[PDB]
């Protein structure tokens, strides 16, 4: 709109819009220690 007053345009040959860009948010590395003992291992060796 601020560029409409100063210069003129043709028809838009294609339509676009504003989109948001981000990394593909996987962030997930499951393992042995996360699923086995998510608690303190001091508790586990006290149980031992």
């Amino acid at each position: 709109y601020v560029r409409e007053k100063v210069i003129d345009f043709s028809k838009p040959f294609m339509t676009l819009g504003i989109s948001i860009l981000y990394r593909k948010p996987n962030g997930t590395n499951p393992g042995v220690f996360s699923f086995l003992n998510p608690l303190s291992p001091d508790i586990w060796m006290y149980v031992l």
């Binding site: 608690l39 303190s40 001091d42 508790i43 006290y46």
Partner: peptide
């Protein structure tokens, strides 16, 4: 002794009493 580790002292006291009472 953690947030769930507070039962260990009661376990140790009960084990000492179970050793001392039985024979």
């Amino acid at each position: 002794v953690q947030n769930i580790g507070g039962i260990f002292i009661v376990l140790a006291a009960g084990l000492v009493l179970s050793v001392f009472v039985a024979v």
